[PDB]
Design a protein around this motif. Structure first.
Motif, PDB file in Angstrom:
ATOM      1  N   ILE A 183       0.878  -1.503  -0.093  1.00 20.41           N
ATOM      2  CA  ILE A 183       0.197   0.024  -0.170  1.00 20.41           C
ATOM      3  C   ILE A 183       0.885   1.203  -0.009  1.00 20.41           C
ATOM      4  O   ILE A 183       0.660   2.114  -0.821  1.00 20.41           O
ATOM      5  N   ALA A 184       1.873   1.143   0.773  1.00 26.06           N
ATOM      6  CA  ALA A 184       2.906   2.356   0.834  1.00 26.06           C
ATOM      7  C   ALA A 184       3.660   2.489  -0.394  1.00 26.06           C
ATOM      8  O   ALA A 184       3.834   3.796  -0.684  1.00 26.06           O
ATOM      9  N   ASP A 185       4.295   1.519  -0.860  1.00 26.47           N
ATOM     10  CA  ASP A 185       4.969   1.396  -1.930  1.00 26.47           C
ATOM     11  C   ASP A 185       4.386   1.914  -3.337  1.00 26.47           C
ATOM     12  O   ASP A 185       5.072   2.487  -4.262  1.00 26.47           O
ATOM     13  N   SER A 186       3.105   1.524  -3.297  1.00 28.11           N
ATOM     14  CA  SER A 186       2.210   1.917  -4.602  1.00 28.11           C
ATOM     15  C   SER A 186       1.675   3.287  -4.554  1.00 28.11           C
ATOM     16  O   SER A 186       1.811   3.905  -5.655  1.00 28.11           O
ATOM     17  N   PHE A 187       1.685   4.030  -3.416  1.00 26.88           N
ATOM     18  CA  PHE A 187       1.401   5.485  -3.289  1.00 26.88           C
ATOM     19  C   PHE A 187       2.471   6.324  -3.936  1.00 26.88           C
ATOM     20  O   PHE A 187       2.522   7.324  -4.455  1.00 26.88           O
ATOM     21  N   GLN A 188       3.820   5.821  -3.661  1.00 22.93           N
ATOM     22  CA  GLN A 188       4.947   6.685  -4.013  1.00 22.93           C
ATOM     23  C   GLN A 188       5.084   6.524  -5.357  1.00 22.93           C
ATOM     24  O   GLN A 188       5.777   7.450  -6.322  1.00 22.93           O
ATOM     25  N   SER A 189       4.746   5.373  -6.138  1.00 23.86           N
ATOM     26  CA  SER A 189       4.885   5.150  -7.400  1.00 23.86           C
ATOM     27  C   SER A 189       3.792   5.813  -8.343  1.00 23.86           C
ATOM     28  O   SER A 189       4.079   6.374  -9.264  1.00 23.86           O
ATOM     29  N   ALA A 190       2.584   5.975  -7.783  1.00 20.07           N
ATOM     30  CA  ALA A 190       1.500   6.646  -8.426  1.00 20.07           C
ATOM     31  C   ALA A 190       1.708   8.198  -8.146  1.00 20.07           C
ATOM     32  O   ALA A 190       1.122   8.851  -9.046  1.00 20.07           O
ATOM     33  N   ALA A 191       2.191   8.537  -7.317  1.00 20.29           N
ATOM     34  CA  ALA A 191       2.630  10.241  -7.083  1.00 20.29           C
ATOM     35  C   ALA A 191       3.632  10.643  -8.167  1.00 20.29           C
ATOM     36  O   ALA A 191       3.455  11.765  -8.593  1.00 20.29           O
ATOM     37  N   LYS A 192       4.566   9.812  -8.254  1.00 20.87           N
ATOM     38  CA  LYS A 192       5.777  10.363  -9.236  1.00 20.87           C
ATOM     39  C   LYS A 192       4.931  10.328 -10.693  1.00 20.87           C
ATOM     40  O   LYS A 192       5.255  10.937 -11.581  1.00 20.87           O
ATOM     41  N   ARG A 193       4.077   9.269 -11.058  1.00 21.82           N
ATOM     42  CA  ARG A 193       3.413   8.892 -12.349  1.00 21.82           C
ATOM     43  C   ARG A 193       2.376  10.312 -12.605  1.00 21.82           C
ATOM     44  O   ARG A 193       2.145  10.729 -13.659  1.00 21.82           O
ATOM     45  N   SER A 194       2.101  10.710 -11.626  1.00 24.67           N
ATOM     46  CA  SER A 194       0.744  11.838 -11.496  1.00 24.67           C
ATOM     47  C   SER A 194       1.244  13.112 -11.795  1.00 24.67           C
ATOM     48  O   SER A 194       0.576  14.003 -12.399  1.00 24.67           O
TER      49      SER A 194
END
Lengths: 488, 502, 479
Positions: free
Chosen positions: C104-115
């Motif tokens: 859950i935590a690792d996916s938010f960091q990857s989704a924030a960079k792509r956003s």
């Protein structure tokens, strides 16, 4: 004292809040589980209130007026309770300010006298418009039948549907008594309505065109089955049975089985018509048409069984000669014949005509009709506010709350259908007060619209009987300052 | 209007959560205890839900619908209840957002109609592929339901019994299989390999006096075997031995004139009644139920004779022969009534070494006979086992962006609710429900559009199309319609009223 | 260990939902009554979370996130709390499915960079060389403040102030180097840039003070002129200052002793040495940067090399103001800074005027780090969810379901904007997604614009916040 009335108000609201979602055909339903463990689900409010059996007198009063609404009328059982309960809520803050309950009861009675007077004015009754029993009902079926393949011919089709219920008694209307048969071949707009009973030609045997189709003074005779040279359970015995038809002078003979070629030869010189293989449902409708009776044998025929119409003729409709009864004002039921290029095309049009008949059927029973869809409900509330200027004083604020209490009916209708009751009430009053007052609320898609244009009508006697029942039941609850319940 | 919308979702979720683990062939069993003290264990959701006696107003709708599902389909017991709870969970999130409940009800109805048209393009034909491949589906239809039981060893024998039984009772015109025309009867003892298919009613009888023959003679090349159906008991006229015997000689003449080989009555017989019937080679049959007489006239093409004076030769039931065949080691020694011609009714004969095996085999055969009806009624079928729900999810979710308005969110919640079944099958298979759901969606998009489901039971690989796993389309179509019909009735009732217990 | 995280998420969700009602100018205001009896009323999220005195340890991290939100972007302190709680609310159903918070935590960091890259492709590319959009950005941002007609002249003053310190590759620039000195009197129409430096106080009002000097040296001196015969002790103090030719004395304000004796005023009057006392402690570090000088504690530490240069030091005559200005610092090592004087008749004017200029300088500074602006009103929140709808199907495994829930949490921000405005929540959001097939970012004609750094930092800070929240599996007492 006055504190008991407040306890009775919450008793009516508790019953109302359960019946609020049940208002309207798309509204929610109540699931009640009786102590007998049998669970039933009913949309109508009568059965819902009958299973509750509330001991509280004010809540039971709303049940008694609901049963009478479903009995003598049958419509408005849920609306009469919501209107009577919501009227109790408007009188709740009036008691806290020191206003006596007597003038509150008499204040609503004055508003009813002004409301009923406006109901007859908002009703639609045409006299000088040069109309008849058809054109009024023909238009109502148009829009309902509009946007169909038959729309081009829809003007001619509405004439045969309305005249179907007009040929019989307007007090008793039955759709099952009207038969419809399909005729292959011919144009669709060339169909003709028949006042009597009609059927096809079941004769498969040679020797047709041997009888005249025009009778000056025909006589209707009903004999179940004889009509045979050979028993299908002697030539002179059949001749004696056929002579009884000659002795009574009857030119019409109908049976449920086929007719032998012996009767067709004897009936030729006497100009007597006979038709066999008639359906059982047709024989019962012919008896009710002439008001006669059927006799088992030919010897027991009584003289009063005979009857006569204006004229008999056999039309060529459908490239085949068919039997029909025309010019019979005493016929209790009619028969419709449709024309078309294919039998499957007529079946699709036939089913579409049943919906148009059921719409004009309920409109013929009650000749007092008002525009529904919030139109009439908004106008009554608006007129009471303008006429309240001479009602000024303590009686003004009582009727002004009665006009606001009339807005609960369209509210629950919009809430149960998904529409927003907040926005629909603000946009409706603007379009109602400005321009035409016929603008209602569309029940399909939320928007301002004219229910008089969509030809969606509601009987006025449902709202008139519910308005007096809601006010009469309200005066009984507001007048009770003490309630004593004995055990037993 | 306040606590009702929240309580109805939690009440139906807790009840539906019971059978979520029992879905599929790998679904775990349960221990049910009857009020008489009998312990039963089965994986069928219809048995579990029917035995539930509860006062909860919301959970009663699951029992009312489950009664109609067994006759129409029978496989929509566990699947629909889990699917119906998925629509309620997605509706709970919409109520908190201010969505009107009727809009949720009408939103699922329009979304269900759009998903049917999508599967109509991707479905495949059976009879168009081959004629014998259709029979291969019937042979493997009962194998799936019986694969989790000891019956799976002899399953090849029970596959041929359902093929010949449906063809006789169902005509290709209406394509309807009546449950009343199929008599389900079984007893304890024996084995499952001795089960035979009978074309008519069994009607077990001990043939009264033992001197009566166990077989019916043709009586000099007579046509068939004529049987007499009597709805009135056989007694001497009343408002001594020779008096009643002389009166019995007048009533037996109606049998001799009509030529009935065997006499069947609803009530018992006297001792002297079997004496006259013994010398005339007329086996006596007594103690016959009222419902058993209906199966006799349908199979033998007979009529119901109300009284003794109405007995005629045209109303006599005609069959091939009646003989007594010993079944296994059972001392009952039942009988077999054959036909040799196609009848309108059949009787299923199932045996087993355990009382539970008999009951589990009769219910499994009931669902197997209904699948054959759906395959004949609809030739187009789809591949289930998790492949159908994922296909319906991607179809509705793709059309959600094309339809604007409030229905845009109604289609998204409906697509997410369809993902509950493949995730439940993934959970019931012991696999990651989220990790597996993403795999099925990736194979149907980047590669090509096909049907790949989740494996509840261990198989060789995915892509059940290779293993020829087929499910009826109209059967799955009936499940999604009853799920939306049940979800509306739950939302259409916002009121709860119940009285006390006196 | 899930009972510790679930207790912190629910406790933090109630705080985020409480601040959620404060989003927008029409949002609901929250009241906090301190134990001392003080009651404050405002919609500011940074003020509410600071004065709430939250005892919950994890919920206190929202104050640090809101602090960095105003320090970096300068806007969205309420929106970053809503976005933080939106991910926490969506994480409740994630734990029910058996998902470990690491994914859950690792996916938010990857989704924030792509956003970020999705917003940059849809953003309008602008440059600092064009002053047309720079003036209109700060002018429309002041429509929420008392200043209305005078805000037209305040926009170009803030633009030219940033363009000098922005350069090109400098990227982030410290906002503490910009000092806004508010004083009673005058008006808003009177403004002076004074790029050299501006002090916070007046000059000597006693007799003999020159109050003005030309070609003088300025330096920081922590010494104080006080008695211990007394004129002889004060003569050596003034003589050592004359050795370095320092005509401007800055003494740190201290309540211990006085600043300059009256006997020393007559000595410095003949030498024409201007003295400015009551220098606040906050300005000690400020004057040591722009002027390039060094704080001098003792008289022996005072040297000529640590003294700056000043063209003209004068005290401007104004009503109730008397502001001293310095121009031409003439320091190559120390970079120039911007100090703007704020004047007004009412005390409530110069107060809110200073805070209004803070939000104007931050938005302009957002363009310095990353150029471009995105129209607000829920446009960037919905546009990201539109791109993540088709991208979620391209993923595989547990993360595939996270992309769908991540886009669902982004819809909370535009939903709250519709609720606080009285309009129907869902109805307005559906109308924005319906027109998304034609329009994209279209609010442009309403002169409402938002910088890209606010929307970028709000996602980055909320992604790391929620990431650090799920990292605490236990709460222990350690003293």
């Amino acid at each position: 004292g006055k504190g008991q009335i407040i306890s009775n108000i919450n008793a009516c609201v508790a019953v109302q809040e359960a019946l609020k979602p049940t208002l309207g055909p798309l509204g929610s339903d109540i699931l009640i589980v009786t102590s007998n463990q049998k669970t039933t689900i009913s949309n109508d409010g009568a059965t819902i209130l009958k299973l509750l059996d509330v001991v509280h007198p004010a809540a039971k009063t709303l049940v008694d007026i609901s049963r009478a609404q479903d009995a003598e009328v049958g419509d408005g059982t849920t609306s009469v309770t919501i209107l009577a309960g919501e009227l109790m809520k408007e009188a709740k803050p009036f008691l806290e300010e020191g206003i006596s309950s007597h003038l509150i009861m008499k204040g609503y009675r004055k508003a009813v006298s002004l409301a009923v007077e406006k109901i007859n004015e908002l009703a639609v009754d045409i006299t000088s418009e040069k109309s008849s029993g058809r054109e009024l009902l023909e238009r109502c079926a148009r829009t309902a039948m509009s946007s169909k393949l038959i729309h081009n011919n829809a003007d001619f089709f509405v004439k045969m549907c309305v005249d179907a219920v007009l040929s019989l008694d307007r007090n008793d209307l039955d759709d099952k008594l009207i038969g419809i048969k399909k005729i292959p071949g011919g144009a669709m707009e060339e169909s003709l309505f028949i006042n009597g009973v009609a059927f096809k030609k079941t004769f498969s045997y040679a020797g047709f065109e041997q009888q005249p189709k025009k009778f000056n003074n025909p006589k209707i005779l009903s004999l179940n089955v004889e009509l045979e040279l050979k028993a299908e359970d002697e030539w002179q015995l059949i001749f004696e049975k056929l002579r009884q038809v000659e002795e009574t002078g009857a030119n019409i003979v109908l049976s449920k089985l086929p007719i032998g070629d012996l009767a067709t030869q004897f009936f030729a010189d006497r100009n007597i018509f006979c038709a066999g293989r008639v359906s059982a449902d047709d024989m019962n409708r012919v008896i009710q048409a002439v008001g006669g009776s059927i006799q088992s044998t030919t010897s027991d025929i009584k003289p009063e069984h005979l009857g006569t119409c204006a004229l008999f003729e056999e039309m060529q409709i459908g490239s085949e000669r068919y039997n029909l009864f025309q010019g019979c004002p005493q016929a209790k039921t009619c028969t419709l014949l449709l024309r078309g290029g294919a039998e499957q095309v007529i079946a699709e049009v036939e089913r579409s005509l049943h919906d148009a008949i059921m719409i004009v059927k309920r409109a013929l029973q009650n000749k007092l009709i008002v525009a529904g869809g919030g139109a009439t409900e908004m106008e009554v509330s608006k007129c009471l506010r303008d006429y309240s200027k001479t009602i000024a004083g303590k009686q003004q604020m009582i009727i002004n709350a009665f006009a606001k209490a009339l807005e609960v009916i369209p509210r629950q209708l919009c809430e149960n259908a998904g529409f927003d009751a907040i926005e629909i009430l603000n946009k409706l009053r603007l379009a109602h007060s400005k321009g035409e007052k016929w603008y209602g609320v569309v029940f399909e898609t939320e928007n301002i619209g004219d229910n008089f244009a969509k030809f969606v009508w509601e009987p006025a006697l449902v709202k008139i009987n519910a308005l007096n029942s809601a006010t009469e039941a309200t005066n009984l609850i507001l007048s009770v300052d003490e309630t004593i319940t004995n055990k037993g | 209007g306040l606590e009702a919308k929240k309580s109805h979702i939690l009440a139906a979720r807790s009840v539906a959560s019971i059978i979520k683990t029992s879905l599929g062939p790998r679904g775990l069993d349960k221990i049910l205890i009857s009020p008489d003290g009998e312990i039963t264990i089965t994986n069928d959701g219809a048995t579990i839900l029917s035995q539930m006696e509860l006062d909860n107003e919301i959970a009663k709708l699951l029992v009312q619908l489950s009664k109609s599902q067994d006759d129409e389909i029978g496989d929509g017991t566990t699947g629909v209840v889990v699917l119906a709870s998925a629509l309620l969970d997605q509706a709970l999130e919409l109520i908190q957002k201010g969505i009107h409940p009727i809009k949720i009800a009408n939103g699922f109805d329009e979304a269900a109609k759009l998903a049917i048209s999508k599967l109509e393009e991707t479905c495949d034909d059976i009879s168009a592929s081959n004629d014998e491949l259709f029979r291969d589906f019937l042979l493997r239809a009962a194998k799936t339901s019986l694969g989790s039981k000891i019956v799976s060893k002899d399953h090849d024998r029970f596959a041929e019994m359902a093929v010949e039984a449906v063809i006789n009772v169902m005509d290709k015109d209406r394509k309807d299989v009546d449950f009343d025309l199929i008599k389900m009867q079984g007893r304890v003892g024996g084995s499952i390999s001795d089960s035979k298919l009978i074309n008519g009613v069994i009607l077990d009888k001990d043939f009264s006096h033992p001197q009566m023959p166990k077989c019916v003679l043709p009586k000099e090349g007579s046509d068939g075997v004529k049987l007499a159906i009597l709805t009135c008991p056989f007694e001497p006229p009343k408002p001594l031995q020779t008096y009643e015997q002389d009166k019995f000689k007048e009533m037996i003449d109606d049998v001799k004139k009509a030529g009935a080989d065997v006499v069947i009555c609803q009530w018992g017989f006297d001792d002297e009644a079997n004496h006259l019937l013994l010398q005339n080679d007329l086996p006596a049959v007594r103690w016959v139920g009222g419902q058993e007489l209906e199966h006799i006239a349908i199979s033998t093409n007979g009529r119901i004779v109300p009284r003794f004076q109405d007995l005629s030769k045209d109303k006599l039931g005609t069959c091939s022969r009646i003989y007594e065949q010993e079944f296994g080691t059972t001392k009952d020694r039942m009988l077999i009534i054959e036909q040799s011609k196609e009848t309108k009714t059949v009787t299923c004969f199932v045996r087993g070494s355990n009382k539970m095996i008999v009951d589990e085999a009769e219910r499994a055969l009931h669902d197997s006979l209904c699948v054959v009806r759906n395959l004949v009624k609809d030739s187009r079928v789809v591949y289930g086992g998790g492949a159908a729900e994922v296909t319906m999810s991607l179809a509705v979710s793709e059309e959600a962006d094309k339809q604007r308005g409030i229905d845009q969110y109604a289609f998204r919640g409906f697509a997410q609710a369809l993902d509950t079944i493949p995730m439940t099958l993934a959970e019931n298979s012991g696999l990651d429900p989220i990790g597996t759901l993403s795999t099925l969606k990736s194979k149907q998009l980047k590669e090509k559009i096909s049907n790949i489901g989740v494996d509840c039971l261990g198989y060789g690989s995915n892509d059940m199309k290779e293993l020829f796993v087929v499910d009826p389309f109209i059967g799955k179509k009936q499940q999604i319609l009853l799920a939306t019909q049940l979800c509306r009735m739950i939302l259409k009732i916002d009121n709860v009223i119940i009285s006390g217990k006196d | 260990p899930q009972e510790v995280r679930k207790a912190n998420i629910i406790a933090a969700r109630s705080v985020a939902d409480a601040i959620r009602t404060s989003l927008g100018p029409k949002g609901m205001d929250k009241m906090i009554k301190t134990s001392r009896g003080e009651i404050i009323i405002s919609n500011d999220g940074h003020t509410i979370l600071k004065q709430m005195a939250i005892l919950h340890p994890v919920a206190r991290m929202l104050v640090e996130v809101s602090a960095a939100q105003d320090s970096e972007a300068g806007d969205g302190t309420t929106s970053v709390v809503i976005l933080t709680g939106a991910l926490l609310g969506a994480a409740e159903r994630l734990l029910n499915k058996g998902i470990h918070p690491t994914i859950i935590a690792d996916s938010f960091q990857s989704a924030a960079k792509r956003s970020v890259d999705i917003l940059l492709e849809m953003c309008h590319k602008v440059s600092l060389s064009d002053r047309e959009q720079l003036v209109r950005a700060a002018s429309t941002s002041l429509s929420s403040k008392i200043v209305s007609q005078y805000s037209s002249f305040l926009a170009p003053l803030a633009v030219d102030s940033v363009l000098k310190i922005s350069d090109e590759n400098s990227k982030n620039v410290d906002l503490n180097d910009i000092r806004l000195v508010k004083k009673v009197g005058g008006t808003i129409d009177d403004t002076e840039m004074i790029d050299g430096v501006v002090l916070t106080q007046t000059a000597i009002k006693s007799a003999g003070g020159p109050t003005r000097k030309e070609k003088a040296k300025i330096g920081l001196i922590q010494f104080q002129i006080s008695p211990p015969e007394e004129r002889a002790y004060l003569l050596n103090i003034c003589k050592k200052i004359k050795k370095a030719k320092c005509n401007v004395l800055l003494i740190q304000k201290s309540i211990l002793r006085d600043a300059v004796n009256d006997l020393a005023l007559h000595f410095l009057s003949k030498l024409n040495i201007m003295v400015v006392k009551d220098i606040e402690r906050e300005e000690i570090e400020f004057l040591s940067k722009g002027l390039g000088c060094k704080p001098i504690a003792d008289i022996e530490l005072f040297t000529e090399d640590r003294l700056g240069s000043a063209d003209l030091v004068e005290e401007i005559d104004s009503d109730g103001s008397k502001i001293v200005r310095v121009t031409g610092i003439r320091n190559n090592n120390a970079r120039p800074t911007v100090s703007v004087v704020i004047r007004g008749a009412n005390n409530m004017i110069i107060d809110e005027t200073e805070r209004s200029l803070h939000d104007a300088l931050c938005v302009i500074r957002c363009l310095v780090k990353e150029r471009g602006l995105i129209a607000g009103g829920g446009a960037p929140e919905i546009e990201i969810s539109r791109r993540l709808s088709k991208e979620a199907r391209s993923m595989e495994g547990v993360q595939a379901f996270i992309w769908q829930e991540f886009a669902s949490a982004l819809e909370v921000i535009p939903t709250t904007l519709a609720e606080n405005a009285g309009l129907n929540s869902i109805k307005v959001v559906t109308e924005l997604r319906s027109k998304h097939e034609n329009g994209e970012l279209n609010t442009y004609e309403e002169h409402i614009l938002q910088p890209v750094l606010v929307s970028t930092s709000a996602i980055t800070l909320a992604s790391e916040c929620v990431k650090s929240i799920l990292r605490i599996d236990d709460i222990a007492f350690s003293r």
